[PDB]
């Protein structure tokens, strides 16, 4: 991975030693990006509901994962399940249980730095993964992207700055998440997010991530070309809010 500092350096070191899982996968992959495009053609707001019990920005809740997933199944275009353990209180069992309980596409969200973590996502029933430009070298990102596609997944390539965007387009990303949160510092910058969104080709499926709580922001971003919206904290604290956000 890249050389990092602070908590990101720690979580990458932890991820490098993550024990892999063994399991026979049951259901073919169903594509999250393709379902997003279908929602766009149907003019249905496409929200990826994220399940995470804890976060570095201070979320700390207990909520049953299956009841959350089954509720979101009716409304969300997909789910994003945190599997990182130390900072997000996620687990592989959580992903396995959710994936086996719903029929909508599932993204495994973690700090992926080795191929076995992609194996883990597949073997646990996820349909895709996030890959984070700012923790990986360009060579690693190219290699892990090809590896994920070899399973039939189209990973969400996460970007936060213009360097990240240059790498993401260079390596052939077709599904990009534009996060307004700098994961190192937790700083939110929506202006920079919008600038990056305006710089992405039309044919890349774009997901706006982080700090989203209100329908009017979703509406503004959709007008700018965003195809789907990753929403975690607001839904973890009031799940029913998704109904208003998709109205």
Closest distance to Mg ion from the beta carbon of 177 (Å): 5
CB nearer to Mg ion: give 69 or 156.
156
Q: Whose CA is closest to 240, among 91, 47, 88, 92? A: 47
Residues 171-190 that bind Mg ion (CB under 5 A): none
Shortest Cβ contact with Mg ion: which residue?
Answer: 209
Least distance to Mg ion from the beta carbon of 109, Å? 6
Is 120 one of the binding residues for Mg ion (CB under 5 A)? no
Give the nearest distance from C-beta 132 to Mg ion in angstroms.
8
Tell the smallest beta-carbon distance from residue 155 to Mg ion (Å): 11
Sign of the torsion angle spanned by Cα atoms 212, 216, 221, 227:
positive
- How many residues touch Mg ion under the rule CB under 5 A: the total is 1
CA distance 180 to 67: 29
| Distance in Å, CB of 209 to Mg ion, minimum | 5
* Three-state DSSP class for residue 228: strand
Task: Between 19 and 90, name the residue whose CB sits nearer to Mg ion.
Answer: 90
Which one, 19 or 58, has the nearer CB to Mg ion?
A: 58
Which has the closest alpha carbon to 159: 125, 182, 187, 128? 182
Q: What is the DSSP string of 17-77?
A: TPPP------S----HHHHHHHHHHTT---EEEEE-SB-TTS-B----HHHHHHHHHTT-S
Q: How many helices (H) and strands (E) does the chain have?
A: 11, 8
Comparing CB distances to Mg ion, the nearer of 131 and 171 is 131
Shorter beta-carbon distance to Mg ion: residue 48 or 245: 48
Residues 192-231 that bind Mg ion (CB under 5 A): 209
Chain positions contacting Mg ion, by CB under 5 A: 209
């Amino acid at each position: 991975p890249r050389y990092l500092k602070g908590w990101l350096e720690d979580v990458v070191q932890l991820s490098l030693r993550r024990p892999s899982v063994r399991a026979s996968r049951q259901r073919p992959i169903i594509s999250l990006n393709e379902r997003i495009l279908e929602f766009n053609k149907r003019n249905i707001t496409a929200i990826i509901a994220e399940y995470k019990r804890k976060s570095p920005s201070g979320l700390d809740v207990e909520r049953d994962p299956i009841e959350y997933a089954k509720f979101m199944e009716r409304y969300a275009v997909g789910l994003s399940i945190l599997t990182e353990e130390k900072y997000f209180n996620g687990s592989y069992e959580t992903l396995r249980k959710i994936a086996s309980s719903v029929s909508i596409p599932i993204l495994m969200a973690d700090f992926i730095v080795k191929e076995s973590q992609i194996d883990d996502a597949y073997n646990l029933g996820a349909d895709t993964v996030a890959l984070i430009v700012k923790i990986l070298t360009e060579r690693e990102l190219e290699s892990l992207l090809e590896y994920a596609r070899s399973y039939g997944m189209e990973p969400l390539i996460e970007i936060n700055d213009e360097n990240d965007l240059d790498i993401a387009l260079r390596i052939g990303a077709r599904f990009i998440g534009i996060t307004s949160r700098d994961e190192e510092t937790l700083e939110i910058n929506k202006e920079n997010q919008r600038k990056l969104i305006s710089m992405i080709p039309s044919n890349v499926v774009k997901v706006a991530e982080s700090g989203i709580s209100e329908r009017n922001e979703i509406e503004e971003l959709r007008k700018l070309g965003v195809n789907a919206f990753l929403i975690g904290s607001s839904l973890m604290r009031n799940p029913e809010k998704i109904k208003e956000l998709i109205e």
